[PDB]
């Protein structure tokens, strides 16, 4: 009845998440800074205080991350749906229902439960990651003048090679959300690495090796403090998700011309609905 609590790990997905979240967090702290190290330690202290607060009421770090993700992914899905509705000239509800229809068709083909009978976070993740990945696929296909199928098959090939170069199973035998995250995170990382390489005037390899080194150093420090790789990922996701949420709220408020508190109120109604769930 016990599982990964026995020390048997998704190691590929964990490394990829460390790399991607580290990239995204570095960009966010650089934009927020004052000093970046000051912002980093400030965010660390705020997250630690919030963790103590949720411990004082009996909420674990994993559950805190789960609720924060419900907030963040709700915001990201809302922004993506709104942008697609505007680009297509239809309402947000139409885009939402088309996304649900498409994802449920794919799950049918796979002989799996649909989004309606899945857990709240898993359903939100499936919807959001499907839309993000499809947007990235169509963008890269347009940019390279190739087929969307070509893009998706090259991405699946690259991720499958990476997986099999680590004694792990292929992309064909992973569960739905894990494969979806593997694909999405790989694509997002490649795009971020390439754009930063162009912006800073250095090679892609420079960026990627700096990233790998930053992550290995953080992991060695955590191991020195007696912190597990899973806990390291959870702390990094807490920091990053808080920063992403705050940026999304600020930007949506500035774009709609409303106060930040109105953005939060709308999000909080919608989210407390799924939180009672």
Experimental resolution (Å): 2.4
Q: Which of 169, 151, 187, 198 lies closest to 16 in space, CA to CA?
A: 187
- Angle CA 91–93–99, to nearest 5: 110
CA distances to 89, 155, 168, 171 from 161, rounded to whole Å, are 40, 10, 10, 9
Q: Which of 233, 266, 260 lies closest to 247 in space, CA to CA?
A: 260
- The CA distance from 61 to 59, in Å, is 7
Residue ranges of alpha helices (H) inside the chain are 11-32, 36-56, 61-88, 92-109, 120-144, 148-164, 176-200, 204-224, 229-256, 260-276
- The CA distance from 118 to 133, in Å, is 20
């Amino acid at each position: 009845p016990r599982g990964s609590s026995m020390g048997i790990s998704r190691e590929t997905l964990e490394r990829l998440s460390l790399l991607l979240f580290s990239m995204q967090l570095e960009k966010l702290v650089k934009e927020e800074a004052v000093s970046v190290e000051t912002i980093r330690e400030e965010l660390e202290r705020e997250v630690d205080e919030r963790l103590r607060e949720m411990e004082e009421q009996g909420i674990s770090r994993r559950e805190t991350l789960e609720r924060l993700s419900l907030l963040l992914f709700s915001m990201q899905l809302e922004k993506l749906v709104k942008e697609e509705a505007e680009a297509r000239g239809v309402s947000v509800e139409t885009i939402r229902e088309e996304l649900e229809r498409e994802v449920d068709e794919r799950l049918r083909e796979m002989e799996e439960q649909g989004i309606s009978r899945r857990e709240t976070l898993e359903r939100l993740s499936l919807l959001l990651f499907s839309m993000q990945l499809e947007k990235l696929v169509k963008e890269e296909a347009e940019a390279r003048g190739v087929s969307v199928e070509t893009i998706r098959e090259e991405l699946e090939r690259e991720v499958d090679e990476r997986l099999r170069e680590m004694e792990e199973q292929g992309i064909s035998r992973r569960e739905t959300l894990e494969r979806l995250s593997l694909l999405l995170f790989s694509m997002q990382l490649e795009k971020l690495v390439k754009e930063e390489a162009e912006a800073r005037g250095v090679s892609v390899e420079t960026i990627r090796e700096e990233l790998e080194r930053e992550v290995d150093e953080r992991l060695r420090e955590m191991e020195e403090q007696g912190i597990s790789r899973r806990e390291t990922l959870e702390r990094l996701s807490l920091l990053l998700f808080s920063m992403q949420l705050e940026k999304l709220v600020k930007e949506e408020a500035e774009a709609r011309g409303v106060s930040v508190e109105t953005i939060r109120e709308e999000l909080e109604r919608e989210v407390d609905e799924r939180l009672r769930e």
